Amino acid sequence: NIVTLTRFVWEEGRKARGTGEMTQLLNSLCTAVKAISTAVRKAGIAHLYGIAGSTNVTGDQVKKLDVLSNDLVINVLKSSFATCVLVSEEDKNAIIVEPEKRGKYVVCFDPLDGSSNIDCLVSIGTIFGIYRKNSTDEPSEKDALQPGRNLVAAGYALYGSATMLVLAMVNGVNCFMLDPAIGEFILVDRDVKIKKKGSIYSINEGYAKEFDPAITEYIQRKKFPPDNSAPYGARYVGSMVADVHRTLVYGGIFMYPANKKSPKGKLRLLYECNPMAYVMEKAGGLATTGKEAVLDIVPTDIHQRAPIILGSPEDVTELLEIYQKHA
Template identity: 30%
Template sequence: MATEHAEGLTEIFDTVAALAPEIREALPGRRVKSDETNPSGETQLAADSYADELFLDRLGDLDGVVEYASEERTKAVHTDDDGQNYDAGDLSVAIDPLDGSSNLQSNNTMGTIVAVYDAPLPASGADLVGAAYVLFGPITTMITADDEGVTEYLVDDGTRQVIREDVTLPEEPSVYGFGGRVPDWPADFADYADEVEADDTMKLRYGGAMIGDINQVLTYGGVFSYPALQSAPNGKLRLQFEGNPIGFIIESAGGRSSDGSGSILDVEPTDLHQRVPVHVGNEGLVERLEAALD
């Protein structure tokens, strides 16, 4: 990883891993809805707010982190005394504290997504120095990506234990997952989906928490899409908290990301909660999708 960010990035990833057991253990008692909505208009669960406050407290205490933003907050929080002044080594963290929290009621997969930028937020994909996600499945695992590649860890007692290094997408893809209501899909995306579904080597894997679907793609190869919709031309997922970090991880693992026309990492940031269509996976599948949407 870049020398000036190596220590700060390691501290951030270690802190996220250290908090994972605490967040997981707190979930059973925080399945109820709160009286608040997040900036995207979604009703927050008590678990969303709890995880957000915990990450702000612990990540904000790190010397290298000068700005914190989450899907649950309207604005970014400056965590140092210098305001918006950026020095060499300073980092911003954008986080989805509990991706897929709607799955909590049904006890399905969820996780945490982390993007680390060396620029003020909102920032572009070019400003990413690292990204990660924690997956709360039957076991707790963590994927990290930096300029040295992608690594998978087991998170045990809040520490990271390497499972796989130099993680890359399998060359032969076998899974797909497409978000949004089918009647709301644009015709060109629906045609692409029909083509993928007609391939009997591909299996549907869609669980209602993006992070679980992404982990399936990273494990087995394939494609995940949350497209532009007729009712939502910019899609549903947020560029800062979901599109950029997931695009960075998949591209670092040898795959492709796209907003439908080019890499998600090239999308110009205009707003902290900006939405973007997200298509990620094996290069051939994403290239075919772009051709279908052209």
């Protein structure tokens, strides 16, 4: 028996006795992701470039891709009827859903992540996190400011060589590969577990001059092992979604620590760090700032940043013990 994304969420929803609202919300993400995937893959681009003449639009319009993604995501989510608040990376303010379309779920998302790789055609993706609304108050920003630990579902779509959607929930992590011939995601990996230990480390070493001594020491150790084993390989694609997926699936460690340009980290906590930390923990892995668990942080700004270290438990831990040794 083959399992499709659609069927899988449905089955899970019954097991959990849902009213179906969260299930429709998930079905809606899928749609969004398929629509983004098709755009990213450049289908229909011959029109932009004149295959039918440059007479095609009467006035002004073409779209950047992340603008489009954002529109797809927002619009599909509202149409779901499952949400009351949304937080996009592209909006200075939480969007609040009209009462007619208002469900009970808060959704944080990065509609298109890894934009310095968009032009060079490198892997890019979409990041999401779902919360249940925890107040009887009219829906506002505060509803989005919960710790990642209160997540009900999270995950990401990866537009790589193929398109994959990874979904994490209370019971674990599942991967579905998009079949673009029939528009259906297919469970291809079930209940995924990251290796305890890894052989790849992933960090942008260009900030070498600004790392703290923990990260400096750890990096040396990945390259000149004290036990004299083979040094870790290094991979940094530059798209968080890509680097984290490879981390999930081959194991190892991903790092985006604090900097002078950012002393608080670069990556966003609501819609980059959190969901990626939820996925890592559901899969037997760790996600820390160096000092504490990403999921336990209570945000104050929807666009707050945080340092993030995630990956195999022995690897992350090894770095936590350096921070400890140092403090």
